[PDB]
Design a protein around this ligand. Structure first.
Ligand code: ZN
Length: 37
């Protein structure tokens, strides 16, 4: 993802903070799982 806040490419959530971002992906965890990197 690009800098200047982060957005989830699944539910379109907003979070500049990595604390919210990292945890937010955990609540998804559906299919793909890294895919390649
Ligand atoms: Zn994400």
């Amino acid at each position: 993802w690009p800098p200047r806040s982060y957005t989830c490419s699944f539910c379109k959530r907003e979070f500049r903070s990595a604390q919210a971002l990292g945890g937010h992906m955990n609540v998804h965890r559906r299919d793909r799982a890294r895919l390649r990197l």
